[PDB]
Amino acid sequence: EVKIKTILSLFLNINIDDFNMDANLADAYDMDSTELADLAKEIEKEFGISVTKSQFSHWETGRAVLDFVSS
Amino acid sequence: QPRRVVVTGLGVVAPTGVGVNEFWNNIHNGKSGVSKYEWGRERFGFKSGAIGQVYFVLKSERKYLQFALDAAEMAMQDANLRPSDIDGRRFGVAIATAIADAAGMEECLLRITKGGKENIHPDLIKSEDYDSFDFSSAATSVAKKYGASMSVSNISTGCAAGLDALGIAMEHIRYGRADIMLAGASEAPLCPLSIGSFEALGALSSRELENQQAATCPFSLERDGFVIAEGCGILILESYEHAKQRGAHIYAELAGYASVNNAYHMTDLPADGMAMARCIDMALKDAQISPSTVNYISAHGSSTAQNDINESNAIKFVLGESAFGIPINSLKSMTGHALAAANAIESVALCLEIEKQYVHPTINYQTPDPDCDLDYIPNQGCSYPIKTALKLSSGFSGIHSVIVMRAV
Amino acid sequence: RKRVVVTGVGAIHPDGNDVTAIKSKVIQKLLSSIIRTLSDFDGAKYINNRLRRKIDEFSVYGIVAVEMALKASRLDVDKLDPNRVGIYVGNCFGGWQHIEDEVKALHIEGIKGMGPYVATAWFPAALQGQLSLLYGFSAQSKTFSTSDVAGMQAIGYAAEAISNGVAEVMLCGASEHLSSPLVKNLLEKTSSQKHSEVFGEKQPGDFSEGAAFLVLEERQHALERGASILCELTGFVDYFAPDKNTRNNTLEYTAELFNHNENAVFIMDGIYDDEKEITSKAFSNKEIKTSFINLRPYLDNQFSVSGVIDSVLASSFLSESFSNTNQIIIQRFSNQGHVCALSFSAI
Numbered sequence: 001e002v003k004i005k006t007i008l009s010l011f012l013n014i015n016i017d018d019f020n021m022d023a024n025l026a027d028a029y030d031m032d033s034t035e036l037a038d039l040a041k042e043i044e045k046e047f048g049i050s051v052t053k054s055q056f057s058h059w060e061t062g063r064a065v066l067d068f069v070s071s
Numbered sequence: 072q073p074r075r076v077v078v079t080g081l082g083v084v085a086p087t088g089v090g091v092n093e094f095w096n097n098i099h100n101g102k103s104g105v106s107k108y109e110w111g112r113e114r115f116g117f118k119s120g121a122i123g124q125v126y127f128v129l130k131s132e133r134k135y136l137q138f139a140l141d142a143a144e145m146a147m148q149d150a151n152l153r154p155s156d157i158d159g160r161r162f163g164v165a166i167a168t169a170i171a172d173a174a175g176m177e178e179c180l181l182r183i184t185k186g187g188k189e190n191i192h193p194d195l196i197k198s199e200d201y202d203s204f205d206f207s208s209a210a211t212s213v214a215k216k217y218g219a220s221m222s223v224s225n226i227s228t229g230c231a232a233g234l235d236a237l238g239i240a241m242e243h244i245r246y247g248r249a250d251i252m253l254a255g256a257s258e259a260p261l262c263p264l265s266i267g268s269f270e271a272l273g274a275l276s277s278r279e280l281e282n283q284q285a286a287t288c289p290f291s292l293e294r295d296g297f298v299i300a301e302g303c304g305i306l307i308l309e310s311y312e313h314a315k316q317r318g319a320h321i322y323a324e325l326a327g328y329a330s331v332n333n334a335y336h337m338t339d340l341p342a343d344g345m346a347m348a349r350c351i352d353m354a355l356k357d358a359q360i361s362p363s364t365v366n367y368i369s370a371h372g373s374s375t376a377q378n379d380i381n382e383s384n385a386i387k388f389v390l391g392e393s394a395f396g397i398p399i400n401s402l403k404s405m406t407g408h409a410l411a412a413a414n415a416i417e418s419v420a421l422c423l424e425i426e427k428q429y430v431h432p433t434i435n436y437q438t439p440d441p442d443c444d445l446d447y448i449p450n451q452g453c454s455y456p457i458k459t460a461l462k463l464s465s466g467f468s469g470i471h472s473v474i475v476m477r478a479v
Numbered sequence: 480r481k482r483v484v485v486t487g488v489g490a491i492h493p494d495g496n497d498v499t500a501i502k503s504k505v506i507q508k509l510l511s512s513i514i515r516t517l518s519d520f521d522g523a524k525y526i527n528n529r530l531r532r533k534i535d536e537f538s539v540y541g542i543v544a545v546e547m548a549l550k551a552s553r554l555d556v557d558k559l560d561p562n563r564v565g566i567y568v569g570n571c572f573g574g575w576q577h578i579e580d581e582v583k584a585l586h587i588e589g590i591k592g593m594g595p596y597v598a599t600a601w602f603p604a605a606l607q608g609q610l611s612l613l614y615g616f617s618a619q620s621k622t623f624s625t626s627d628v629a630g631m632q633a634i635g636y637a638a639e640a641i642s643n644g645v646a647e648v649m650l651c652g653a654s655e656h657l658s659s660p661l662v663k664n665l666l667e668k669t670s671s672q673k674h675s676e677v678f679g680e681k682q683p684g685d686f687s688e689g690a691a692f693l694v695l696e697e698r699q700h701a702l703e704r705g706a707s708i709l710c711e712l713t714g715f716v717d718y719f720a721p722d723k724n725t726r727n728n729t730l731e732y733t734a735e736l737f738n739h740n741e742n743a744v745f746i747m748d749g750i751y752d753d754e755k756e757i758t759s760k761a762f763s764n765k766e767i768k769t770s771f772i773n774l775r776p777y778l779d780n781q782f783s784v785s786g787v788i789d790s791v792l793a794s795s796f797l798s799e800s801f802s803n804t805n806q807i808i809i810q811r812f813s814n815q816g817h818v819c820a821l822s823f824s825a826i
């Protein structure tokens with residue numbers, strides 16, 4: 001959704017138009033473990049659901065974060 | 072003109088033991104000082120359930136200042152220094168810290184905001200609260216007590232601050248500014264803000280365990296983070312000539328010091344460990360000692376995935392094929408991680424190890440890691456003749472720090 | 480021993496966002512307390528949004544100050560060997576602005592309250608690490624948090640590192656952010672009434688945030704690349720006074736920096752009332768005759784930045800820009816009873 005895409009755009013400092021939802025976060029956008037932990041904290045803030053280290057480790061791309069919050 | 076630096080006094084407040092005698096006995100036998108704690112999981116909801124405590128409602132106990140005064144008193148009595156021997160102009164202090172009295176600052180903030188619910192009430196701010204924000208409370212208080220008139224400093228370089236305080240203290244004595252120097256570090260980070268900060272970062276051990284003492288296991292395949300701890304280490308450094316004239320007992324010679332930056336990441340450490348390897352090399356050039364004489368290493372050993380592999384590959388790069396024989400240990404397996412204080416406490420332990428020609432073990436060694444394949448002295452220690460000792464430290468902002476200690 | 484020289488300076492302050500703007504204002508002003516914020520300042524052009532998101536304002540003030548200082552020095556930063564460049568910083572209060580809400584939310588919500596950047600944003604040694612990632616500087620780098628005289632020690636021990644031959648270049652200086660609600664309410668109430676047990680009562684004065692940095696480098700290295708040398712760092716003093724008796728004896732070490740020079744200007748701490756009496760008496764004993772100039776009423780108390788910003792101005796004055804002075808000596812001291820001083824000489 002638009003609420004997810006705006007966070008990943010702001011956190012990685014990419015243009016929201018140019019940002020790809022299917023692209024790898026670690027490889028393409030050189031995302032580190034601290035940024036992934038910071039992303040997971042704001043998923044807990046926005047949606048209001050429990051997120052642990054085992055769960056957000058599998059968030060490989062911008063579509064993986066959308067598939068989790070649906071469940 | 073350059074003068075040799077020697078350790079004449081030791082003072083320690085650690086979870087393994089308070090005082091030199093109690094501290095040594097526990098680390099000798101390989102007894103864990105790690106305690107299980109309940110207020111982390113129940114109140115705040117931290118995955119961590121282990122801390123290195125020495126002895127839920129918020130309290131400003133001023134532990135950071137307390138541990139510094141206690142360790143300094145023990146160190147000065149051990150050195151056998153008295154007003155007659157001490158020349159104020161040639162005697163300076165260097166007590167380091169990573170967060171200083173953060174507990175007092177956190178407690179002050181929540182008190183004035185009434186449990187962090189409302190805005191800050193100006194009227195509730197007490198006159199005594201300003202002392203909590205003073206980073207160099209430990210340095211100035213000790214300097215006041217024993218009349219230190221030479222340079223008083225507070226190095227706050229994270230978890231490398233301990234060795235950096237010993238480093239600047241060594242420079243003062245060597246280049247002829249000071250005769251005596253009280254050096255070390257004090258840390259009191261067992262507060263929700265400090266523990267929560269690392270917890271949120273994911274640097275603390277979070278794996279489910281039957282025994283919480285095993286949560287800190289350096290160079291083990293099971294390791295998943297460092298067990299946070301509190302305490303203080305104080306070393307009385309002074310000139311070789313100054314110590315001999317008053318007939319002082321010498322623990323070990325502090326031969327050389329070096330410090331570098333990773334230029335890689337703030338918290339993450341690289342696998343190759345080239346930066347740490349360069350720091351060890353420059354420390355040996357500074358001490359004017361050959362790497363061939365190095366037969367013991369007091370490693371940082373936080374028990375994180377990235378730190379232990381970094382140090383192992385760093386030692387492998389400098390020594391090479393000769394690295395495998397050398398006993399390497401981490402005190403954080405028993406004490407946990409006291410940040411800046413851990414360098415000083417391990418530096419006190421290192422001085423006792425060289426004196427007594429004994430090497431303390433790395434306890435909680437479970438499954439051996441294929442990557443970490445050096446001698447880590449697992450579980451049981453032994454008598455070992457130490458000639459030239461290395462002491463590796465690492466902290467945030469990619470800071471590596473090494474000191475070279477030597478037997479006299 | 481190696482000769483150390485100042486090649487570049489950068490500072491930002493409520494009075495100015497550059498060294499020339501600050502120097503022009505203080506000269507004009509030379510001819511209950513509040514925290515003075517910066518005017519017409521934003522760190523969008525200097526620092527990218529990814530990095531700025533995860534650092535406190537004290538680190539932001541530090542990076543913009545270092546960038547201005549390196550630009551003035553005209554150093555080819557890419558060609559410079561990273562192993563021979565270090566970063567010395569002075570910071571007392573840390574970075575509360577970035578973590579305040581997260582520390583409060585931890586005690587209501589729990590772990591969900593505070594994120595993972597609380598560990599690197601708040602600590603004073605954040606600035607040195609942040610600089611080392613951007614520029615790649617790999618030599619000995621330390622941070623001091625000694626109350627008041629943190630930045631004064633940072634410059635002195637950065638010069639000693641160049642003297643002993645640890646590094647050829649050093650980015651030494653200080654930075655502070657005092658506008659965060661916790662430290663703002665603290666300084667506005669407690670700091671005014673508190674007296675020094677060693678020195679005495681405080682003068683009426685405000686507080687100001689910002690940063691000040693110098694590019695110290697080895698003299699032969701500076702002459703090699705044909706650098707515009709502002710001044711030479713000739714001496715550094717770092718002592719303590721546990722009581723009033725030793726206090727007056729310690730000031731005589733500041734008098735030794737002069738080398739009996741009559742064409743010298745003495746920049747004073749300007750915090751405490753009794754300074755002018757005790758320091759002038761120490762000079763009277765050593766037969767020193769100099770001009771007293773206090774910049775503290777105009778610049779305010781900046782903690783670690785205080786004394787460093789003075790050295791930034793003093794370097795600009797001695798660089799062919801009071802009448803004709805060939806040496807400026809700056810003094811600072813703490814509440815607990817430090818005595819720190821730096822000596823800068825012309826050509």
Ligand SMILES: CC(=O)CC(=O)CC(=O)CC(=O)CC(=O)CC=O
Pocket residue numbers: 169170173228229230231264265268269408409410411465466467468597598599600601602
């Ligand atoms: C008390 C807080 O809120 C957390 C901090 O910022 C303090 C801090 O983070 C000190 C530090 O850097 C520790 C290291 O370098 C690695 C040592 O173990």
